[PDB]
Every structure is written in C-alpha cells, then in structure tokens.
Amino acid sequence: PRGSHMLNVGATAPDFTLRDQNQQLVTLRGYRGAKNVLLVFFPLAFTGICQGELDQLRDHLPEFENDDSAALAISVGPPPTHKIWATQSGFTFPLLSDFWPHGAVSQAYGVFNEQAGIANRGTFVVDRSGIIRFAEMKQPGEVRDQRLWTDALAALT
C-alpha cells in the first residue's frame, strides 16, 4: 500500500489474485518458475492514451504471450467493463480487475493515483522468481514504448 511511490527494480512483486474479463481468477504466483510476466497498469477502459498503448500490445501480442512470457493488463474496472472493451478492441490477453478493494493492487505497486482513484500508466516485468526486473511510470502526456517491453523480456533468458 504505497499510493504512487513506484516499486523499484529488485523488489519482490506483490502477489495478487484478480478476475479477468471472463471471470477467471489469475494469480501472479502461478507463473513463478515458468514465465516472465509483463504487468501493464492502465487508468480507464474506453478512454485515454491507454487505448493506443493496449492496441500496440495487441498488435504485437505473440511476442509477449509465449512459452517464456505472459502479459497481464490491470485496471480498476470490473470484468463486464473489460469484457466489452476487449471484444470491441480485439484484446485476447487477460485484463484484470483491481476493482474491490478499489485499486488495492495498484497501490501495492505504488502506481495508484489517490486523487483520481485510477492506476497511473506503470509497467513492470516480473521474472520467474517473482522479482521486479523492469519498472516504469509514464508522466501525463508520454506514451509507453512497447519495444522497450519486448527488449526487457528478451533479456530475461
């Protein structure tokens, strides 16, 4: 529980179990020993810079979801909201609901905007040991770079 003091590289990634857009439970620990995990926090479905960011993820998804890697997008929306958006947008990767308690996982990663009640645009790569290996927060206005995500992942083996 850290508001917006982003966790740093070398920290243990906080565990979570959240519902995806099809109401399945996704748990970060379940990847430990098996894949590196890209976590893409985003503020609000249907609006903002994050439509373009998630569209880049989509447009390069086989590079992020494979035998070595998984990608999970996280926001405060509940599953029905993420289902509709994912269907319209062509998103087939998990969108997870940090919905109730509201923003709890975003807060644990230090990427929550307490004033607005939404996640900031933070991104992490978690290795097979559960350790944060890459961390960023983008300041209002600048869009994240999906090429940098793939490069971070490629370095992890």
Domains and CATH numbers, the chain: 1-157 (3.40.30.10)
Catalytic residue among 50, 73, 125, 135: 50
**Nearest-angstrom CA–CA distance, 147 and 105:** 25
**Nearest-angstrom CA–CA distance, 6 and 108:** 9
Backbone phi, psi, residue 56, to 5°: -60, -40
Query: How large is the angle between the packed helices 49-59 and 146-155, nearest 10 degrees?
Result: 50
Strand ranges, E, within the chain = 17-19, 25-27, 36-41, 69-75, 95-97, 112-113, 118-119, 121-126, 132-138
Kind and range of the H or E run holding 81: helix 79-89
**Nearest-angstrom CA–CA distance, 13 and 133:** 9
- Asked if 50 is an active-site residue, the reply is yes
